[PDB]
Symmetry: D2
Subunit: 331 residues, 4 copies
C-alpha cells in the first residue's frame, strides 16, 4: 500500500554524540548506522519512505529526551531548542514530514504555553512526551500527568484539538535499581516500556482525565502497551468490583478506547496481535507506525503491505485514520 | 464439560479474621461472603465444584500470604502452619482436592527443605508463591528468585518434578508510594498484579533459570500476565537486538513457552484472549483455572463450558493437560 | 445493546397455514410454535423484539417463497399478493417493522417493475430473493441473475438505490436427486444453503455484475455463506491464475467485499467466526440479523448482547451499519 | 523449519500429453513449466524440497485422474498402471518420497484389493481419491462412498490402518452444465472443489461411515473445504434440530473432527484462516501441505516458515503430526 502515514518516528540533535551512542548501546546493534539515521531528517529518511510506500511521517524527539532532564530550566531550554530545530529541518518537505511538539513537563502552564507556541507558529501536529518527567534534586522523582494540576495543560491540548502521544522512557533512579538493574535485558521494548506507559495511561483513565477532558486524544504505541490483552479482565474488575468499591471514572475502559485512546503498530509487526486488536480495539482506532530508526522500514512495511485483511481496514489503519485524526491535507 | 481441573484456588487461615477481611475489602463487593468462602475447604467449595463440573482443584494459600512476612522466622513458621493445616483439611477428599506448597522464600535451602517435606509427606502437587518475598528491616526489600543462589531450590523442584506457580502480590513500600498510591484502583487484577509476575517470570528467562534448570515448569495465571500479547515483540527484540548486545539465554522466548512455561485461564474468562493464546502459546500449554473465591465458579465455568472450540483443545485445557502435568490419579469424573 | 436491527426475518401467508405447519414438522422441533410465529406479524414478533433489545426488523417472505413457483403468471401473482399483504400488515408499526420486496424472477423487466412499485408505494427497504428462480415445464431449470439479460433489473435496483438480499433455498429436482437425496440431513443450514448462495454470489462477481452496476449492494446471510473462509484462496486463484487465463472481472474479491457485498450474522452466532470476519471482511460490512423464526431471539440476542468486543464495531454491526445502508429513519420511539 | 512433510503433491503420467495440457490449461499460467513439473518425480521436485526445507513428500496421482474414467475396466487398468509406475519412479529416494494409492472406485471389493496390494508391496502411505467416481454409460453418474456397500472397503482401510485423502475433482456432465458452465471461472480452487469435497465428507459423517468405522482417518485439503467456517452452525443445527428430527450419527461434528477427520494447508496459505482453524479444528489435527505443482513450493514454504505461532504447534503441523499419522520412517532432516 502506498501513501502510508507513520507517527512514532524519532530524530536526535546532531550535537548529542555521546547521548545518542549510549541509547544506541542499549537498543541498536549498529551504533554508527543508528546515529547516522537518527540524525538524518531529509536524506536517508525520505529515501526509505520512497522505497517502502510511506507518504508522510510525523517526527518526534528521541527518548528519553526532555523527560530525562530533571532541572526545569535546562529541560525547557532543550525543548525549545528541539522544537525550533526540527521545524527548520523539515520546512522544505511539507508534503512528506510533519512534527510533534517536544515538551518539558515540569510545569503545566509552561508546557501548555510551549505547545501552543509551536502548534500555532510551526503547524506541529500534536505533542509526543516520553512518559513521566524526571524531577527532584537528583532526578529520582516522577511527574505523572493525571493529577488535577494538569487540567490547564489538557485544556490547551483540546483547545488546539491535537493528539498527545504517550511514548515510553527507560526506568531510572531507585525504581531502576530495585526492579530492573538485576534483570536489565528487560529494559525497553521487551517489558519496561509497556509497563510504564500502561500504568500512566490507565492512571489518566481511572483518575478522570478523560472525564474532565472528553475531547482529549491520547495515542499509545506498540498496539497499546499490553492493555488490549487484558481488556476483558480490566473491564470485568472495573465494572464488577472496583467501581462498586469507589472507582469513579464515568465510562468503561471500552468506552475510553472508543473515544479517547488510539494505538499504533509501532515496533509490533505482529499479524497475530493485530487481529486480536481488531476485536478488542477496532480498526477505527488503530494507526500504522514504525518506531524508526529503532525499527527499520523494511520490517514494518514489508509486514504491513503483505497483510491479508479486508481492504477497508487496511486503508484506515494504513493512512486514512491518521489523515482524519491529524487533519492532514493531501500529502 | 465434566471433570475439569482448576489450580489457582485460594484458602485462608480461619484465625486471620482481620487480614482476610482487609484483603476482602479491597477485592470483593461482599466481604462477608468472601471471607466465608476463602475459609471453607470442604463444604461450599465442593458444592460449587459439584454444580459446575469441576472434578478436582489444587488449593493454595491466599495472597499476599507468606511473601508479605519480612521476618524470616515468622515467615517460615507461617508456611509450616499453613502446609500442615491444609494437608489435614483436605485429607477426606483425595479425589476432589489437592494442595500446592506454601513457602517462605527468604532462604533457598530452607524453602527447598519445606517443599521436599510437604511433597514427600503430604503429596502436595507443587508450589505456589506470591511473587517476591518481602524482606529487610521494614519489609521494603524484595527477594527475586532468578539469581544463581536459588539453584539449590530450583534443583529441588525439578528433582521432585513438580511445577511452581508464580502468583502475583500487591505492591508495597516505596514502590507502592512512587507508582501506585496516586492511581490505586489499578492495584491488583487491573494492572499491578500482572506487572509484578511478568517482570519476575521474564527475569527467570533472561537470568537463565530455565537454562540452569531445563526441566523446570513454571505456571502463570491470568493467561500469562500480558506476556503473550508481546510474544512477537519480545522475540524480535531478544533475537535481533538484545542477544547481539549480550543477552545470553540459550533459547528463544517461544522455546521457553513451549518447554518451561504454562498459562492458566484464572480470572481471564475471555474467549477473545484465549483464541489469541491458542496461536501465541498453544493449547498444549494452557490450563483451565478459576481464581476462586476472587472469581466465582459460575463465571468461570459457564464461560468455559460454553466455549465453542475444538474438542481436543477443550479437553486438554479443561483437564487432560493438568492430569499429566500434576500426575494426578483418577479423580472425580476424570475419565470419559 | 438496545435498538438492534435485524433483517433476515421471515413471514408466511396465513392462508398457507396448514402447509406451513406440515413443513415445519419436518425441519423444526416445535412445529406448532414455528408455524404460529412465522405467521404472526405484530404480536409475538414485537414481544420478542421488546424483550431482546431489537428496535427494528425488516421482514421477508419465507423460502423457498416465490422462487419455488415455476409458472410465471402464478409466481408474479403470488409476489404481488405477498407484497400487498405485508405492506398492510405492518402499516401500524412504522418505527418497528419494515419489509423487503418479494419478487418473481422469471423476467428481468417484470421483476424490475414490481420492485419499483412496492419501493415507491410502500417504502420497502430492498428486495429479498431466495436464490435461483425455478423454471421450465417441471420447474427443474434455474434462473441465475448474473447474465446480461438481468442488467435491466440491476439498473432499477441502483436507480432505487436499495439493497438486494440473496437468501438460500432448498435444492430441488434433478440436482436434489443426484447430490442431496442420499445425504438429506445436509439440506439447509448444514451445507446446501451456503453452497447455493456462494455459487450465485460469486457468479455475479465473476460475470461482472458489480462492474456494470458499481453501486449495487448485495447482502449475504450466515456470515457470507463460506466465502470469507476462502477469501485468501479465492483472491490468490483469481489474481494469480484465473485472471491471467481470461477472468475479466475488473476488481479483486476483496474490493467487491469492500464496495458491493455485505454479510449478516443470521443463524451464525459464532464469536469465533465473527472475530475471523472482522479481519477478512471488516466491521463496516457486517450486519446483525437473527433468521427468525428458524432461530429464536434469545439465541441470537443473548449472544450478540454478550459479545466482548470494542464498542465502535459493536454499535456498527448491531444497528448503525443497517441504519445507513437501508436509509432507515430516525426512530423517535424506543419500546425496548 | 526443516524436515517439513507435504502430502497433497501431484504427478502425471508422461504419456498423457493431452490430458495434462488440458488440466493445465484450466489451472496453470505457464503450461510448459507446469507440464515439466507435474511429470518430473526426482529432479526439479527434490531440488525444490532441498530449497524450501521439505524433507519428505507423499506423492499422489493428478486430478481428476482415475475418478474421471467411467469405464470400470479402463479405470482399474489406469489405477494399476499409475501405482506400479510411481512405486518404481520413487524407489531410489525412500528418504524423500512416498506415495498414496491411486484407486478405481467403481467397485468396493476391487478398490479394497488394489489398496491392499500396493500398501503391502510398495509401502504406500494411504489412498488419495479425487471425490466421486464417474460412472454410467456417458459418465454422468457419481459414485459416493458413504453407502453401506462401501463397508467392505472401509474395513480394509482400517485393517491396513492407513488414511484416506478425499481430494476434489472438477464438475462434469449435467451438474457442470446446469450450475458451473455459465460461471466457469469458479471451477476448481475458487469454489467448485470445496463444494464437492465438503458434500462428500459430510455425507460420510451423517450417513455413519465413522460410526461403522471408528478408526477411519479421512484427510481434507484446503483447510477443510469450507467446513470449519460453519463448525458452529453445523454443530448447532445437527445437535439442536436435525438429530431430534432423525439424524442418527453417534457423535457431534466436533467429535468427528477430533477423532476421524484431518485438514491440511494445501493451497490455503492464509495466516488468518489457519489461526481461525487453531480454534475450530486444533493444531493436533492440521497438516502442512502444498498442492504442488498447482501451487509452488516458495509460496507455501515461505508462508509456513514465516508463521509467527507457538513452537509446539508449528512443529506438529509442519511435520510431527504427519510423522505419527503416516507412520513415517526416518526421513531427511526429520529430526
Ligand atoms: Zn491437490
Amino acid at each position: 500500500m502506498l501513501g502510508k502515514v507513520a507517527l512514532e518516528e524519532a530524530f536526535a540533535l546532531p550535537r548529542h554524540k555521546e547521548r545518542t551512542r549510549w541509547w544506541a548501546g542499549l537498543f541498536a546493534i549498529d551504533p554508527d548506522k543508528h546515529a547516522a539515521e537518527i540524525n538524518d531528517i531529509t536524506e536517508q529518511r525520505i529515501k526509505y519512505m520512497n522505497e517502502h510506500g510511506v507518504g508522510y511521517t510525523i517526527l518526534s524527539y528521541t527518548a528519553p529526551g526532555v523527560q530525562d532532564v530533571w532541572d526545569p530550566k535546562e529541560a525547557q531550554a532543550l525543548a525549545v531548542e528541539v522544537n525550533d530545530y526540527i521545524a527548520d529541518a523539515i520546512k522544505a518537505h511539507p508534503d512528506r514530514l510533519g512534527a510533534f511538539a517536544t515538551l518539558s513537563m515540569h510545569d503545566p502552564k509552561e508546557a501548555a504555553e510551549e505547545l501552543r507556541r509551536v502548534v500555532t507558529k510551526y503547524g506541529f501536529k500534536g505533542a509526543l512526551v516520553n512518559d513521566t518527567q524526571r524531577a527532584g534534586a537528583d532526578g529520582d522523582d516522577m511527574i505523572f500527568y493525571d493529577g488535577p494540576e494538569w487540567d490547564v495543560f489538557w485544556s490547551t491540548v483540546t483547545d488546539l484539538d491535537v493528539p498527545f502521544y504517550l511514548h515510553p522512557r527507560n526506568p531510572t533512579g531507585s525504581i531502576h535499581e530495585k526492579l530492573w538493574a538485576k534483570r536489565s535485558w528487560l529494559i525497553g521494548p521487551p517489558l519496561s516500556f509497556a509497563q510504564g506507559v500502561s500504568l500512566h495511561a490507565l492512571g489518566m483513565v481511572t483518575n478522570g482525565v478523560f472525564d474532565r477532558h472528553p475531547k482529549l486524544q491520547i495515542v499509545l504505541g506498540h498496539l497499546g502497551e499490553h492493555i488490549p490483552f487484558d481488556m476483558w479482565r480490566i473491564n470485568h474488575w472495573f465494572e464488577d468490583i472496583k467501581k462498586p468499591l469507589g472507582l469513579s471514572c464515568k465510562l468503561t475502559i471500552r468506552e475510553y478506547f472508543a473515544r479517547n485512546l488510539w494505538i499504533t503498530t509501532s515496533g509490533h509487526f505482529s499479524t497475530s496481535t493485530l487481529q486480536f486488536c481488531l476485536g478488542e480495539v477496532g480498526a477505527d482506532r488503530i494507526l500504522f507506525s514504525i518506531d524508526y530508526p529503532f525499527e527499520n522500514f523494511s520490517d514494518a512495511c514489508t509486514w504491513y503491505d503483505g497483510l491479508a485483511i479486508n481492504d477497508v481496514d487496511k486503508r484506515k489503519i494504513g493512512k486514512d485514520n491518521a489523515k482524519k485524526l491529524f487533519k492532514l491535507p493531501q500529502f
